């Protein structure tokens, strides 16, 4: 095997990367990497475009709840489960979507915008932090509130060095689990607070969502590490090329003469001395003595293959980040239907995975945290004859699924024909087909049974879905 | 035969590779090869893209259980087998998919995330290790927990040399079988523990999944050995080319004169001395004496054939890794439907093989480990009059199949038409067609029989699948 | 005839190859050729791709048994043959597909994985060896075990010279048949054992599978001898071209002056002395005295015709190995449907031949070895009133056919239409149509007759295959 060897001619003799865990590689330069990722996101067109694509495709314009408790395990009954789910869904829908935005302490974000911010933070910071608090002064129906904590705030107190149990502001028990986090207080023009992960009663107090790569990993790594250097180098190349083009296009001509500069421009260029401005009106034919000369400068091609090199670098960056090349670069060159569909599918697989993990876990944990007080305050009533209480089986009572914006297809008619053909056979159900369009099938049925009554009352022809 | 000969003109005279086992080639430089593969994965856009493609296509966004015990062998009866399968599937679904993430000791990953991490570890490290433990302090329903052990941790104690029976921290019996493993403890700012492969009762304590190449192979080899050198050399070429382009684009022009440098720029470039900055506003025509000169530099083509060489190297890398060229390089050049379908099939065969072996074996062993407690703690009851106990035939009781995300078609209508035509004939069943879409046909049937009742109750037109 | 003559102008005067058997050409340099093939497989991207294609297409993701005993010969009856086949197939499932992997001594591979490893070994080593042993300490139902022996281990004892009867560790009787083998024991940081080919009772103890080319051939030859030299030379050319491109791209410019190097770089390049680093920010216009000079280097085309030469060499290599050019090189250039189908058929013929011979013979012999104990231990009962007992006609009792993964075609709809039309006419049966899809028609019928009952019980519309 030449992987561990010296190389072809010994070229890989100096390539001896150390063997170390993910923590040993990531933690020493965590803050610098995060700052560089933030710099790239704020001040580069492509990084901001990638973040916007992540936000728009992973979550969308809405994030909707679907409460499906496991009634078999609980032994309560299907109808009671349906009634409980309807009540819980109504309560959650009013709680999250108030215009006062009292879901968060800062009163600036709704639930959907909070999910989008969490996804964005997971993108260029590798993780997201959420804290759940209670305000006693509040007289509203619910006291639960959520605060989005930036990863920069969590760090070791007093800027102390890492230990075996405490790393990067995270306290670790004997196992890999985390017991608590140290959150700093930021003064824009310091102190640290201990926040336990979970309350003694089992409620989740502070939320941390990230995907671990190796066995022992305390905090996550942003996606920009793969292509961080190339983005900066490409920005430098773009600025240099633009400045060079401006400079080369500036010098249009050159005057050579042995006379005074005022005299030379007077006799050759045509300026009026009554250095010296020249009027652009008209065409001029100067007369030159033997010593005089007039040279019109020629410049190189403004874009001499910079476009193709930029194309290659943008393909590399899009491969590193995960978004499609066309989406990142806005190129959308000529291509057949099959190629566009294949690229869309390749991007959609990654987007679906990100939605399934990050946003779904965050929303599920927030929903469980809210549901615990909702049940405690008797806003909703648990079904009777339950095998287990809410505390004993939290996941069983609070099992849920989340629906986001569906993919907008290149051909609208083909997808509709496919859906109709699937519905005609037994391969698919109404729920799955409506969920692909970002709709709830029960709401569609209610709207249809309302519309048929409205049509009948007005005297119009009954709709297709109506039963004779 | 010229294979063992000197060559055409004697060119292969120095090519005399040693004849040795896979262990003799792999073990001496195991750690350096693993470290180089990790370096490529962390810091190259293409390697990270390949790992992400592996994770997404091999597993997907979900990994689902299908329990099919062999009822004929055990002599229990079909209906008891179906009831047992329903119970164990429900228990597994609740156990793996809790939001508390209590399946693993570190409480960071769900079952699907652990499967994806195992696939990733198999990709760039050549193997995956899983440890199953019990916590007695836990008061939950199940005490089983799983921990993913990095391959770096398994090594010979005290960094001692390999022996005949103990190689790379694995103790080997007279045959090729492994009896136990030595796992180190990592301190981020050492000691070794003996972990037997199997408990005395026959339970699996330590899990090791990899594909052997030759007869005697203690540990597996990463996939990057084939293309390790080329990726590093291509990265060096890319960085060098980018720096060279930036350098050549930087120098726009050149001034030649015998005067002072400030005066030369004042009279020619146009800088103001009130070295010296020059304003970009306007167009200028300087006046030059005989000794003076102005030269506008021209540069070579920025991308002069680098794209084609990069294409060739990327095809080589994609051949080595196994992913498609379009997926790896994000190129997706103009191509017909047939070529895209052929490349997709060529990649899908490899992905299906990897899913059938690695993830399936890992998930099956974890499921058996959980099922042993589940049966022991009497959460589920074995059918009566069974020929053999659970211990005597573990595979018969725990026979199962796993379903992941299905391939996304380039043309949605064509696959639906194909599935419908197959269903109409006897060549296919409902289960196989639903499995290709990542769905369970029994859940679809339950949803349909619920939806028909819902439509009937609300007064809507009965669905197609309903029976008159 | 000029084939044996001097040539056109005497150019073939030195071309006088010796006339010798295959053994005389192969045996003297067997080990060096095998080592070179192993080196190419481990360390070249294309060779690994070819081996992976062999494994994926010849075997696939599964290998399945179809027991077809010849009842007419033995005069037992069709129904008894069916019952015996069902029992044997069930028993072979459990032995081969246990998760404990107790089929092999090393407990690392399942039956399909051992078949794939055998195919791979036949690919780059020219043959495969399998050993069947018994473990008395085992308390399981079956004591049969299989060990894949690397071809390197079999060699002459004490590294002695070959004889008339003993060549390369294989003892040959008066005829060409082999009586036994000498297998060495490998110590990774020596002794030889005599293993007879067959037990005295007729059972197969040692398995050797290879295709003979000529009359007397003791051991087989790998496929790589045809194209090993070209692969090594192409790898050298690729590495040299990459290094040359990096070297030529590295030198961006050149400074010529009579001053000191520090002064020259300060005045021309723009470095700061407060050798000398230069910041890349901005565009610069240096001033040069008559002695000074600035030159921007221009390099040759990075990929100047290397791609087409690589294409030709890859076509030659793919022709030598037997795989299609597109599969080997991942090129998949623009091409019509007919050309793609023709290339796919050309490759599929070779893959079907390899599957029919190598894997089928290996699996059949292993199945016979297992079936002998299975019958002896009375796990399965032979039908009564049989003409010849198991010993008299092993092949008649153990006649079987093996099924692998079916070909993935470019157009899914066309293949389904073709299969439906063939089924409608009398040209084809259900078994052949289901076999091309890698399915067992009896299993499909059982699944259909279950699904129709499941649909009827739930109240859904009866399936198409149901009989009124």
Chains that touch B (3 or more CB pairs under 8 A): A, C
CB C415 within 8 A of CB B415: no
Buried b / exposed e over A224-248, threshold 16 CB at 10 Å, is bbbbbebbebbbbbebbbebbbebb
Task: Work out the number of other CB atoms within 10 angstroms of the CB of residue A354.
Answer: 21
Measured between beta carbons, which residues in chain A are less than 8 angstroms from residue C47? none
CA separation for the pair C264, C246 (Å, rounded): 26
CA separation for the pair A100, A107 (Å, rounded): 7
Helix axes B337-354, C337-354, angle to 10 degrees: 30
Nearest residue in chain C measured CA to CA from B413:
C413
What is the residue whose two structure tokens read 């991490």? Answer: B117
Q: Where are the alpha helices (DSSP H) in C140-204?
A: none
Task: Work out the number of other CB atoms within 10 angstroms of the CB of residue B454.
Answer: 14
Buried b / exposed e over A252-267, threshold 16 CB at 10 Å, is eebbbbebeeeebbeb
Measured between beta carbons, which residues in chain B are less than 8 angstroms from residue C32? 3-4, 16, 19
CA separation for the pair C440, C86 (Å, rounded): 13
B451 to A84, A432, B462, C13: CA distances (angstroms): 19, 12, 9, 87
CA separation for the pair C421, C431 (Å, rounded): 15
CA separation for the pair B212, C109 (Å, rounded): 8
Measured between beta carbons, which residues in chain C are less than 8 angstroms from residue A247? 283, 285
CB C116 within 8 A of CB B353: no
CA separation for the pair C131, C129 (Å, rounded): 7
Task: Work out the number of other CB atoms within 10 angstroms of the CB of residue A139.
Answer: 7
Of C109, C58, C46, C79, the closest CA to residue C321 belongs to C46
CB-facing half-sphere around the CA of B77: CA atoms within 13 A: 7
Task: Work out the number of other CB atoms within 10 angstroms of the CB of residue B457.
Answer: 9
User: Nearest Cβ partner of B186 from A21, A25, A467?
Assistant: A21
Residue B194 — φ and ψ, nearest 5°?
-90, 120
CA separation for the pair B97, B110 (Å, rounded): 7
CA separation for the pair C34, C396 (Å, rounded): 38
Of C439, C363, C430, the closest CA to residue C401 belongs to C363
The span from the first CA to the last CA of chain B, in angstroms, equals 76
CB A325 within 8 A of CB A314: yes
Of B306, B299, B314, the closest CA to residue B241 belongs to B306
Do A19 and B94 count as a contact with CB atoms less than 8 A apart? no
Q: What's the gap between Cα C194 and its chain centre?
A: 29
What is the DSSP pairing of strand B166-167 with strand B170-172?
Answer: antiparallel
Measured between beta carbons, which residues in chain A are less than 8 angstroms from residue C303? none
CA separation for the pair A67, A228 (Å, rounded): 41
A217 to A20, A179, B96, B188, C280: CA distances (angstroms): 12, 15, 21, 10, 37
DSSP class of C62: -
Of C362, C376, C364, C359, the closest CA to residue C143 belongs to C376
What is the residue whose two structure tokens read 């990899």? Answer: B210
CA separation for the pair B414, B408 (Å, rounded): 12
Measured between beta carbons, which residues in chain B are less than 8 angstroms from residue A318? 330
CB A213 within 8 A of CB A382: no
Q: What's the gap between Cα C2 and its chain centre?
A: 40
Tokens of C252: 């961006």
Task: Work out the number of other CB atoms within 10 angstroms of the CB of residue C262.
Answer: 12
Helix axes A228-250, A30-43, angle to 10 degrees: 40
Task: Work out the number of other CB atoms within 10 angstroms of the CB of residue A194.
Answer: 10
CA separation for the pair C189, B23 (Å, rounded): 9
State the DSSP string of C121-158: HHHHTS-EEEEEEE-SS--SS--EEEEEE-TTTB--GG
CB A132 within 8 A of CB A206: yes
Do A1 and C43 count as a contact with CB atoms less than 8 A apart? yes
* Contacting residues for B376 by C-beta, under 8 A, at least 6 apart: none
Which residues partner with A129 through β-bridges? A149, A208
CB C432 within 8 A of CB B427: no
Of C122, C97, C127, C91, the closest CA to residue C109 belongs to C97
What is the DSSP pairing of strand C287-288 with strand B253-256?
Answer: parallel
Q: What's the gap between Cα A420 and its chain centre?
A: 33
CB A317 within 8 A of CB B45: yes
Sign for the pseudo-dihedral over CA of A66, A71, A72, A77: negative
CB C364 within 8 A of CB C355: no
What is the residue whose two structure tokens read 């102005």? Answer: B294
The angstrom resolution of this structure is 3.2
SS3 C345: helix
DSSP class of A29: G
Sheet-wide strand order for C287-288? B293-296, B253-256, C287-288
SS3 C88: helix
Q: How was this structure determined?
A: cryo-EM
CB B246 within 8 A of CB A236: yes
CA separation for the pair A411, B410 (Å, rounded): 12
A417 to A348, A423, B389, B466: CA distances (angstroms): 21, 10, 52, 21
B37 to A7, B30, C335: CA distances (angstroms): 15, 11, 36
Chains that touch C (3 or more CB pairs under 8 A): A, B
CA separation for the pair C194, B122 (Å, rounded): 38
Tokens of C79: 């129904």
Tokens of C298: 């221009």
CB B321 within 8 A of CB C326: no
CA distance C284 to chain A (A): 9
Do B12 and C296 count as a contact with CB atoms less than 8 A apart? no
Do A8 and C239 count as a contact with CB atoms less than 8 A apart? yes
Tokens of C233: 């030379």
Computed on alpha carbons and rounded to an integer, the radius of gyration of chain C in Å comes to 32
Measured between beta carbons, which residues in chain B are less than 8 angstroms from residue A359? none
Rounded (10°) CA dihedral C436, C439, C440, C441: -70
Nearest residue in chain C measured CA to CA from A243:
C283
CA separation for the pair B325, B315 (Å, rounded): 6
CB C295 within 8 A of CB C254: yes
CA separation for the pair C417, C430 (Å, rounded): 14
Counting one residue from chain A and one from chain C, the pairs whose CB atoms sit within 8 A come to 20
B313 to B52, B225, B241: CA distances (angstroms): 20, 15, 15
User: Nearest Cβ partner of B246 from C28, C105, C280?
Assistant: C280
Measured between beta carbons, which residues in chain A are less than 8 angstroms from residue C334? none
A247 to A236, B250, B271, B282, C295: CA distances (angstroms): 16, 11, 13, 10, 19
Tokens of C468: 């009124």
Counting one residue from chain A and one from chain B, the pairs whose CB atoms sit within 8 A come to 351
CA distance C285 to chain A (A): 10
Of A192, A194, A187, A127, the closest CA to residue A158 belongs to A192
State the DSSP string of C285-304: --EE-SS-EEEE-----TTS
SS3 A215: coil
* Contacting residues for C27 by C-beta, under 8 A, at least 6 apart: C162, C167, C168, C218, C219
Of C20, C19, C24, C15, the closest CA to residue C221 belongs to C24
Measured between beta carbons, which residues in chain B are less than 8 angstroms from residue A299? 296
Do B250 and C284 count as a contact with CB atoms less than 8 A apart? yes
CA separation for the pair B267, C287 (Å, rounded): 12
B419 to A421, B60, C428: CA distances (angstroms): 11, 22, 21
Rounded (10°) CA dihedral C42, C43, C44, C48: 20
Tokens of B11: 């060119």
CA separation for the pair A309, A233 (Å, rounded): 12
CA separation for the pair A193, A170 (Å, rounded): 12
State the DSSP string of A277-325: ----SS-------TT-EEEE-----SSSSHHHHHHHHHHHHHHHH-S-H
Which residues partner with B401 through β-bridges? B66
CB A30 within 8 A of CB A218: no
What is the residue whose two structure tokens read 């020929």? Answer: B387
Tokens of B61: 């966004």
CA separation for the pair C183, C194 (Å, rounded): 7
Tokens of C184: 């060495």
3-state SS string over chain B? CCCCCCCCCCHHHCCCCCCCCHHHHHHHHHHHHHHHHHHHHHHCHHHHHHHHHHHHHHCCCCCEEEECCCHHHHCCCHHHHHHHHHHHHHHHHHHHCCCCCCCECCCCCCHHHHHHHHHHHHHHHCCEEEEEEECCCCCCCCCEEEEEECCCCECCHHHCCCCCCEECCEEECCCCCEEEEEEECCCCCCCEEEEECECCCCCECEEEECCCCCCCCCCCCCHHHHCHHHHHHHHHHHHHHHHHHHHHHHECEEEECCCCHHHHHHHHHCCCCCCCCCCCCCCECCEECCCCEEEECCCCCCCCCHHHHHHHHHHHHHHHHCCCHHHHHCCCCCCCHHHHHHHHHHHHHHHHHHHHHHHHHHHHHHHHHHHHHHHHCCCCCCCCCCCCCCCCCHHHHCCEEEECCCCCCCCHHHHHHHHHHHHHCCCCCHHHHHHHCCCCHHHHHHHHHHHHHHHHHHCECCCCCECC
From its phi and psi, is residue C342 left (phi > 0), alpha (psi between -120 and 50) or beta?
alpha
Of C408, A347, C50, C321, the closest CA to residue B342 belongs to C408
CA separation for the pair C275, C263 (Å, rounded): 12
CA separation for the pair A4, A25 (Å, rounded): 20
Tokens of A230: 């190339």
What is the DSSP pairing of strand C170-172 with strand C293-296?
Answer: unpaired
CB-facing half-sphere around the CA of A69: CA atoms within 13 A: 30
CA separation for the pair B134, B150 (Å, rounded): 20
CB C211 within 8 A of CB C128: no
B269 to A85, B298, B464, C279: CA distances (angstroms): 77, 18, 82, 22
Of C262, C282, C285, the closest CA to residue C273 belongs to C262
SS3 A64: strand
3-state SS string over A144-167? EEEEEECCCCECCHHHCCCCCCEE
CB A96 within 8 A of CB A114: no
Do A236 and C460 count as a contact with CB atoms less than 8 A apart? no
Residue A315 — φ and ψ, nearest 5°?
-60, -45
CA separation for the pair B149, B128 (Å, rounded): 7
Residue C374 — φ and ψ, nearest 5°?
-50, -40
Of A360, A380, A356, the closest CA to residue A370 belongs to A380
User: Nearest Cβ partner of B424 from C152, C288, C464?
Assistant: C464
Which residues partner with B170 through β-bridges? B167, B181
Burial class (CB in 10 A: 0-12, 13-18, 19+), A125: buried
CB-facing half-sphere around the CA of C303: CA atoms within 13 A: 17
CA separation for the pair C92, C95 (Å, rounded): 5
CA separation for the pair B277, B270 (Å, rounded): 9
Tokens of B463: 């669905």
What is the residue whose two structure tokens read 């639906």? Answer: B416
């Amino acid at each position: 095997y030449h992987g561990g060897g010296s190389g072809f001619g010994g070229q890989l003799r100096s390539w001896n990367p150390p063997s170390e865990s993910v923590d040993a590689a990531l933690l020493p330069n965590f803050t610098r990497g995060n700052a560089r990722a933030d710099d790239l996101v704020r001040n580069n067109g492509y990084a901001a475009n990638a973040i916007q694509l992540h936000q728009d495709h992973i979550v969308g314009s809405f994030f909707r709840l679907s409460h499906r408790p496991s009634w078999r395990y609980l032994g309560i009954g299907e109808e009671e489960a349906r009634a409980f789910s309807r009540e819980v869904e109504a309560a959650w829908k009013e709680f999250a979507e108030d215009d006062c935005c009292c879901i968060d302490v800062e009163r600036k974000r709704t639930f959907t915008m909070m999910i989008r911010e969490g996804v964005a933070m997971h993108a260029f910071n590798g993780e997201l932090f959420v804290q759940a608090t209670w305000d006693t002064s509040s007289s509203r129906l619910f006291r639960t509130q959520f605060r989005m904590v930036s990863p920069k705030r969590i760090s070791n107190p007093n800027n102390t060095g890492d230990s075996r149990n405490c790393r990067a502001g995270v306290q670790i028990n004997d196992s890999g689990a985390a017991l608590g986090y140290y959150v700093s207080e930021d003064g824009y023009p310091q102190k640290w607070t201990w926040i336990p992960r979970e309350l003694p009663g089992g409620r989740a107090s502070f939320i941390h969502v990230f995907e671990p790569v190796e066995d022992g990993q305390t905090r996550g790594a942003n996606v920009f590490y793969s292509v961080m250097e190339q983005m900066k180098m490409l920005d430098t190349l773009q600025n240099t090329q633009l400045q060079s083009a401006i400079v080369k296009a500036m010098y249009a001509a050159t005057i050579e003469s042995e006379l005074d500069t005022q005299s030379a421009m007077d006799f050759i260029l045509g300026a009026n001395s009554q250095a010296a401005p020249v009027r652009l009106g008209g065409a001029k034919v100067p007369h030159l003595m033997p010593g005089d000369s007039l040279n019109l400068q020629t410049a190189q091609d403004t874009d001499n293959g910079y476009s193709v090199f930029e194309q290659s670098l943008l393909r590399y960056i899009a491969a590193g980040l995960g978004v499609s090349y066309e989406q990142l670069s806005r190129n959308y060159a000529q291509m057949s239907y099959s190629t566009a569909r294949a690229s869309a599918n390749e991007s959609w697989a990654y987007f679906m995975g990100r939605r399934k993990f990050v946003a779904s876990r965050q929303a599920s944990q927030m929903f469980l945290c809210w549901l615990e007080e909702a049940i405690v305050r008797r806003v909703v009533t648990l079904p009777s004859k339950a095998r287990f209480s809410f505390q004993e089986a939290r996941s069983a009572w609070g099992n849920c699924d989340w629906i986001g914006s569906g993919r907008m297809a290149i051909d609208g008619l083909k997808e509709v024909q496919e859906a109709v053909m699937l519905i005609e056979a037994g391969l698919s159900t109404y729920e799955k087909e409506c969920a692909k369009r970002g709709d709830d099938y029960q709401e569609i049925f209610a709207q249809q049974v309302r519309e048929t009554m409205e049509r009948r009352a007005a005297g119009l022809k009954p709709p297709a879905w109506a039963a004779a």
